[PDB]
């Protein structure tokens with residue numbers, strides 16, 4: 164826990180967010196086909 | 207400001223050891239530790255005497271456990287004799303690794 | 313090598329994890345529950361397959377079907393009452409298993425611990441669906457109230473409870489689903505067990521002392537095959553003692569009544585294995601709060617590795633945890649009691665303090681005790 | 692890999708064992724059991740028994756109350772008045 | 773495994789061929805030792821306290837001759853089959869077979 | 884001198900594992916029968932006349 | 946209500962005796978196999 168936290172680590176986190184951010188978008192797309200929200204369909 | 211409380215604690219510590227199985231077993235307190243990656247390296251750092259000792263002790267101990275027999279009252283580990291022989295070794299190993307983290311962190 | 317049967321076949325070498333393996337000397341009787349654990353998995357299966365050789369999975373018949381297995385079919389009665397009782401054992405055994413892991417710090421084997429946990433929960437699902445197959449008053453309702461307890465989830469829940477059921481209630485649709493998943497879980501679980509065994513084979517069996525035994529290791533074949541056979545012998549004993557002398561005793565539920573959807577046993581409750589889960593839900597006023605806390609009951613297991621505070625993975629040398637270990641067990645017994653209790657003041661107030669005690673014992677007390685003991689030893 | 696030749700390293704330890712056929716499998720069992728059983732139970736009892744005792748009280752009390760409060764149908768509030 | 777194996781095979785499966793070769797080996801072993809003065813002197817001395825005052829030398833060949841593959845099989849099974857071993861090592865004995873394993877090696881179910 | 888009962892038994896049946904096994908097969912057979920017989924008897928004794936075996940008379944062949 | 950149970954009690958008696966007999970032998974059989982480890986006493990020998 165404490166060991167993992169570090170001043171140095173931030174670039175990796177920033178990089179992760181984009182890949183992570185990109186990954187997050189896919190789920191919404193993936194969920195949406197199954198979910199079939201009328202509003203989502205409307206979008 | 208610990209004179210009475212700590213004094214009770216010192217008495218309590220003997221009871222705790224007495225309460226603890228290792229003292230009853232006769233094996234040293236240091237020997238009892240969960241063999242993980244730091245203990246492991248400490249272990250490896252032991253001299254032949256210290257280290258072969260810890261092997262017989264555990265041998266004699268797992269033998270007893272297998273037979274559900276306790277050692278004679280005369281031959282038991284007394285709290286007053288707390289060989290914390292792993293402690294020295296074990297500290298550094300940790301010390302090294304904590305650093306490693308510091309260097310790695312920055 | 314030549315004509316060393318074992319390593320000749322590559323396959324037969326893989327079986328030398330039983331015969332040739334390094335097994336610690338010292339070793340309480342507690343470890344026989346691993347083996348018995350498997351024993352039970354194999355017995356349920358053989359039993360299941362024969363019952364599912366004369367069972368039908370419809371509203372109309374299911375009750376009849378079981379009823380027919382226990383009456384007209386030759387030795388179907390014992391097979392079925394052996395199957396019911398077994399599952400009790402299976403759980404009685406499971407909870408010894410996890411006790412041991414809790415107490416001697418076998419759970420240090422994180423990867424093995426995480427499989428265990430999956431194991432435990434998978435069986436848990438199994439047991440929940442099988443009991444519903446016979447489609448009797450207890451089963452019928454128990455499924456509704458558990459499943460519905462999933463509708464606590466805010467956004468989805470509601471939709472999702474309806475998918476699981478295959479409709480708005482628990483008619484045929486649900487009943488055949490449980491039949492199919494009950495059937496296929498145990499097979500999947502066996503794969504898991506073996507995967508569990510795989511990981512454990514990489515570091516061998518911890519001991520009561522809590523120290524490595526590498527300096528004392530024994531033939532598994534010579535010694536531990538008889539122990540295990542002996543273990544069986546006692547295990548079976550208990551399973552037949554139950555099954556032959558008191559078939560229904562341990563099967564609290566007396567509801568041999570075909571399920572009538574308007575009717576209700578005011579006293580609705582899961583079986584002994586699931587009794588603890590029902591109790592956990594009760595102490596929280598809010599539905600959702602109760603479902604979270606129910607999951608956390610069981611799911612809190614995987615934390616304990618991280619909670620470990622002492623330097624001695626063995627509780628054996630630390631009095632204080634030996635005391636709070638036992639109490640948790642007796643708190644667990646206390647909770648099981650609540651499970652079969654009217655949900656009224658007396659029991660409510662008790663359960664609530666038991667559910668806090670359980671999470672304290674696991675989350676907060678023990679971990680501190682660890683530290684203390686370490687500090688008294690000067691560690 | 693190989694589990695028997697590769698466990699650990701052990702120097703200077705002698706072991707002495709005997710054959711099954713030369714010894715007895717039941718070594719003064721009554722005599723050892725009593726004293727060993729006795730000696731460990733008494734070192735267990737204190738650490739184990741308490742919490743169970745506790746549950747029993749709570750069971751006992753806990754059932755009394757129920758029966759009372761419910762059988763004491765007049766418990767809550769009296770009749771005459 | 774191989775050794776014990778050999779034992780077993782011996783008392784169940786000895787073939788005349790095999791015994792006949794060992795036979796002959798024995799003769800030689802027993803003749804060639806007796807080459808030289810020292811050797812003969814020891815046989816004669818020790819023979820007398822051991823076997824008493826006989827010098828079974830020429831007998832041998834006779835005795836050795838009575839050897840049969842059945843003889844060798846029945847004689848071996850008195851002493852090795854079902855009998856409890858006397859095993860010592862001076863480790864690395866970490867892999868040395870458990871007493872019970874060694875023991876079960878003196879009878880033939882499988883292996 | 885004669886061999887203790889065990890020694891007798893040993894040399895006749897347990898040296899060779901073929902014999903041993905043969906024994907056990909045989910034994911398993913013999914044993915099942917005696918056990919049952921004895922153990923069934925014992926159990927019927929404890930419930931004299933309670934069981935249909937005892938009670939068939941009443942309505943049988945007049 | 947319990948046709949099997951009536952048969953079961955009789956079976957239980959047979960089962961009870963066999964299990965008891967089997968258990969006694971196993972404890973004895975089990976003891977012999979594990980006797981060697983239990984019988985053995987290992988004495989540490991000083992290197993020098």
Ligand code: HEM
Pocket residue numbers: 353356357359360361362363364367378392395396399402435438439442443444445446494495498
């Ligand atoms: C450990 C895994 C399993 C557990 C915990 C388990 C448990 C149960 C339970 C508690 C019941 C209710 C019986 C009653 O009280 O009437 C049941 C019924 C049933 N189970 Fe199992 N079972 C398991 C595996 C299996 C397997 C593998 C099969 C099929 C191969 C199977 C087939 C059945 C059938 C057909 C019934 C319905 C008839 C009856 O009530 O006996 N079960 N199971």
Ligand code: HEM
Pocket residue numbers: 342343344345346347348349350353406409410412413417418419421424425426427428429430431432433435501505508512516517518519613
């Ligand atoms: C399907 C149910 C299970 C079966 C058949 C099973 C079987 C076994 C067996 C036969 C052993 C070896 C003996 C022993 O230590 O008792 C074992 C060990 C172990 N099991 Fe399980 N198990 C099951 C469930 C679990 C669960 C639910 C977990 C934990 C979440 C778990 C975790 C462990 C661990 C950590 C060990 C090793 C302990 C040690 O010796 O240090 N097991 N299991």
